[PDB]
Amino acid sequence: GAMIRTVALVGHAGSGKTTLTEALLYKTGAKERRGRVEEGTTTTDYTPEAKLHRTTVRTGVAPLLFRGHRVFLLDAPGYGDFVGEIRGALEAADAALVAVSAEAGVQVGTERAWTVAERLGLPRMVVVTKLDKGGDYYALLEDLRSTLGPILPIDLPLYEGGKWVGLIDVFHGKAYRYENGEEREAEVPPEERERVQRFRQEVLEAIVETDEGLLEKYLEGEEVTGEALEKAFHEAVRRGLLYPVALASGEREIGVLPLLELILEALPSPTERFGDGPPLAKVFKVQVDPFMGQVAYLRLYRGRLKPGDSLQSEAGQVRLPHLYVPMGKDLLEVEEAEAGFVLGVPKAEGLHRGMVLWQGEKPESEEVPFARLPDPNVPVALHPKGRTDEARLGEALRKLLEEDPSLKLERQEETGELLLWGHGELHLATAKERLQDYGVEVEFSVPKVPYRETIKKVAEGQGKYKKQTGGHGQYGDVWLRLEPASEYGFEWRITGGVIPSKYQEAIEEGIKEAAKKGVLAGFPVMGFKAIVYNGSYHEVDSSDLAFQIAASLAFKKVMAEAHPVLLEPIYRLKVLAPQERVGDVLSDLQARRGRILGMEQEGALSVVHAEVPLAEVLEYYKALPGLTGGAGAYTLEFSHYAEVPPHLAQRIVQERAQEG
Numbered sequence: 251g252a253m254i255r256t257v258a259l260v261g262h263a264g265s266g267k268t269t270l271t272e273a274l275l276y277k278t279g280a281k282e283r284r285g286r287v288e289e290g291t292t293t294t295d296y297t298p299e300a301k302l303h304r305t306t307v308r309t310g311v312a313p314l315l316f317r318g319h320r321v322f323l324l325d326a327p328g329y330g331d332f333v334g335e336i337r338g339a340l341e342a343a344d345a346a347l348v349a350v351s352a353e354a355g356v357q358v359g360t361e362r363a364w365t366v367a368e369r370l371g372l373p374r375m376v377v378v379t380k381l382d383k384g385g386d387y388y389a390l391l392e393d394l395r396s397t398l399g400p401i402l403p404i405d406l407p408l409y410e411g412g413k414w415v416g417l418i419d420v421f422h423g424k425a426y427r428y429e430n431g432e433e434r435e436a437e438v439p440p441e442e443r444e445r446v447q448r449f450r451q452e453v454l455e456a457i458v459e460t461d462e463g464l465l466e467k468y469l470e471g472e473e474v475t476g477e478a479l480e481k482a483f484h485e486a487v488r489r490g491l492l493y494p495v496a497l498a499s500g501e502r503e504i505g506v507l508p509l510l511e512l513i514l515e516a517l518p519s520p521t522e523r524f525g526d527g528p529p530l531a532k533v534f535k536v537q538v539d540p541f542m543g544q545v546a547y548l549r550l551y552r553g554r555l556k557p558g559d560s561l562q563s564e565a566g567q568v569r570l571p572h573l574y575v576p577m578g579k580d581l582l583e584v585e586e587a588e589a590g591f592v593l594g595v596p597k598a599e600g601l602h603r604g605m606v607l608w609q610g611e612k613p614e615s616e617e618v619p620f621a622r623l624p625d626p627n628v629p630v631a632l633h634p635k636g637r638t639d640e641a642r643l644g645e646a647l648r649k650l651l652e653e654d655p656s657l658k659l660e661r662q663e664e665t666g667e668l669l670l671w672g673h674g675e676l677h678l679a680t681a682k683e684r685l686q687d688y689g690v691e692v693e694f695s696v697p698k699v700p701y702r703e704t705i706k707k708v709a710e711g712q713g714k715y716k717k718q719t720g721g722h723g724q725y726g727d728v729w730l731r732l733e734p735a736s737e738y739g740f741e742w743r744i745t746g747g748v749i750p751s752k753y754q755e756a757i758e759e760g761i762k763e764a765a766k767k768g769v770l771a772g773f774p775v776m777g778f779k780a781i782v783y784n785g786s787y788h789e790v791d792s793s794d795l796a797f798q799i800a801a802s803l804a805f806k807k808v809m810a811e812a813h814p815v816l817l818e819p820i821y822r823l824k825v826l827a828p829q830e831r832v833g834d835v836l837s838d839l840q841a842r843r844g845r846i847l848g849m850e851q852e853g854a855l856s857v858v859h860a861e862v863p864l865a866e867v868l869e870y871y872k873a874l875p876g877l878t879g880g881a882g883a884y885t886l887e888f889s890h891y892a893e894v895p896p897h898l899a900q901r902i903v904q905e906r907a908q909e910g
C-alpha cells in the first residue's frame with residue numbers, strides 16, 4: 251500500500267512504448283480515451299516535432315495511479331538522435347522497462363538503452379510488444395537469453411486458433427483472454443500444459459538459486475513458501491540478477507494492467523535504492539514549450555516535500571510554493587510529493603538540466619545518478635533566414651539549448667561560422683523545427699572546410715617599418731628566415747644585441763598574426779620554423795607596434811618566396827556495413843578520395859578503416875543509410891593535414907581569390 255515506483259520505458263524506435271503508455275493511462279482512468287500515435291493524440295507525443303516525425307522526440311511523464319500505488323513512468327525516445335532524453339530518463343528512474351518488438355527482437359536501440367541502464371546499476375524488465383503481428387515468442391525468449399542473460403519468463407502467449415488473445419501466467423498456471431481490452435480467466439490449453447509446467451519449473455529454479463536461504467532448503471528437500479519465493483524474486487530483480495519478461499500490447503489492449511501489477515511486484519521502490527533520509531533530487535530534463543515558459547522536471551530520489559518547502563542548490567534556495575506532477579504537457583497540482591515522484595516546476599528559468607537539489611549535507615558525485623552524454627558529432631553551419639530571424643536568433647537558441655543540452659553551439663574561430671552540433675540528421679531537423687516554434691526561421695549549410703597553408707622551401711628576407719606621426723616616429727627592422735617544419739617553432743637568433751630581447755615577444759606576435767592569413771589563399775599557415783636572425787632598432791622610435799608590423803611584413807614577404815602550398819584536413823573514417831553492402835561503401839569511398847587502410851569482420855558485417863578528406867565527408871551521415879540499407883554506422887576523427895591535390899588546390903585557390 252502506498253508503494254511508489256519510478257520507471258524509464260526505453261527500447262528501439264517503434265517498439266510500442268508510447269502506445270503502451272497510452273494504454274496504461276487509459277486503463278487506469280487517467281484519461282478518457284486511448285489516443286493514437288498515428289493520429290497525434292497521445293499524451294507523450296505533443297510537441298510539433300514529435301507529432302510530425304511520429305516518434306518520441308521528448309520524454310513524456312505518465313504519472314500512473316493504480317489501487318493507491320503510483321508508478322511514475324517516463325516514456326522515452328527510441329532513436330539515438332535523442333540520446334540526451336533517453337539517458338536523462340534512465341538517470342531519473344530506479345529501473346528500466348525495455349520494450350522489445352516480437353517481430354524484430356533485440357535491436358541496436360534496445361542494446362544502447364540496456365547498456366546505459368546497466369552502467370547506472372538499474373534493474374531491467376522486458377516487455378514484448380507486437381506479438382499480434384505474427385512472431386515466434388519462444389524463439390524470442392531463447393534469443394533474449396542469448397543476448398541479455400538471466401531472463402525470467404513471467405508470461406507465455408495464449409493463442410486461440412493461431413490468434414494471440416491473451417496471457418498464460420507461468421507462476422500461477424492460470425490463463426487470461428482478452429476481448430476489447432477486457433480480461434476473463436481462461437483454461438491453459440491441454441496441449442500447452444507440459445510446456446507451461448517446464449517453464450514454471452525453470453522460473454522457480456532460477457529464483458531459488460539467487461537466495462541462499464531458499465537454495466539451502468531446495469538442496470535438502472524442504473518446502474519453499476510462496477511468500478519466500480516472492481521476496482527472493484523481488485530481491486533478485488533489485489540486484490540485477492534476473493530480468494522478468496512480460497507480454498503486453500497497448501494496440502491489442504492485452505496484458506496492460508497485469509504489466510502494471512508486475513512493475514509493482516518486481517521493480518524496486520526509491521527506499522530500496524536510496525534508503526530514507528533528507529530530500530535529494532535532480533533536474534533530469536527541461537522543456538521550454540511555446541507559451542509555457544521554462545519547466546524543470548525533477549526526480550525526487552529521497553525524502554518528502556510539501557507545498558512551501560525549499561531545496562538547496564548550487565544557485566541558492568529553490569522554493570516550491572506549489573507542487574505539480576506532469577502528465578505529458580499538463581501540470582497537475584498535488585499536496586505532497588514522496589520519493590519516486592517526478593515534479594514539474596514552472597517559471598523555472600533558473601533551473602537547468604543536471605542540477606542537483608537537496609536538504610542537509612550536499613551530495614558528492616557517488617550519491618547522485620549520472621549518465622554522461624556523448625558529444626554531438628554532426629555539424630551544420632547556422633544562418634538566420636532574414637532580418638527578423640537574426641534579431642530573434644540569440645534568444646531562440648538560448649531556449650533551444652536549455653531544453654536540449656545534447657546540442658552544442660560554437661563559433662568556429664577559424665572559419666567564422668556559427669556551428670550547431672547534433673546527434674544525427676533527425677536530431678538536427680527537430681532543432682530547426684523547434685527554432686521555428688520559437689518564431690525563428692534558420693537554415694543549415696555544410697560547414698566550410700578549415701583549409702590551411704604551409705611552405706615547401708626555405709626563404710629569408712627583411713621586414714621593415716619606419717614612419718613618423720606628429721612628433722613621434724616608428725621604427726622596426728626584422729630579418730626573418732622561414733623553413734618548412736613539422737610543427738611551429740620560433741627561434742631568436744639575434745646576435746650583438748642588434749635588437750633588444752624586450753622586443754622578442756612583439757616580433758613573435760607579429761609573425762603569429764600574419765600567419766593567420768597565408769599568401770596562397772588566405773588560410774592559417776602552419777608547418778614552419780620562424781628564425782629572427784638580424785635586424786636593428788633605434789632607442790627613440792622603436793616600439794612593440796613597429797616591431798609587430800615589421801615582423802608581419804617580413805612574414806608576408808618571405809612566405810611568398812617559400813613555395814606555399816594548400817593543405818586540407820584528413821580524417822580517419824571507420825565504417826561498419828553489411829557484407830553484401832561493402833562493395834557500394836568502398837565504391838563510394840573511392841569516389842570521396844578515400845584511402846582504404848584495411849578491413850575487419852564482425853559476423854556478416856565488416857569494419858572498413860579509411861582516411862578521407864574532411865571535404866569529401868561533411869555529409870557522409872546523410873549518405874550512409876542508403877549505402878548500407880540503413881544498417882551502417884560510422885565514426886569520423888581528425889587525423890592530420892595533407893597537401894591538396896594540385897587540381898583541387900588550384901580551383902580552391904581560385905575560388906578564394908575570385909571573391910573575398
Ligand SMILES: Nc1nc2c(ncn2[C@@H]2O[C@H](COP(=O)(O)OP(=O)(O)OP(=O)(O)O)[C@@H](O)[C@H]2O)c(=O)[nH]1
Binds near residue numbers: 263287306379
Ligand atoms: N500491431 C501492433 N502495432 C503496435 C503495437 N504497439 C504499437 N504499435 C504500433 O507501432 C507504431 C509505433 O508505436 P509507438 O508507440 O509510437 O512506438 P514507440 O516505441 O513509442 O516509438 P518511438 O517513440 O519512435 O521510439 C504505431 O503504428 C503503433 O500503433 C502492437 O503491440 N501491435
Ligand SMILES: [Mg+2]
Binds near residue numbers: 268269305306325
Ligand atoms: Mg514513443
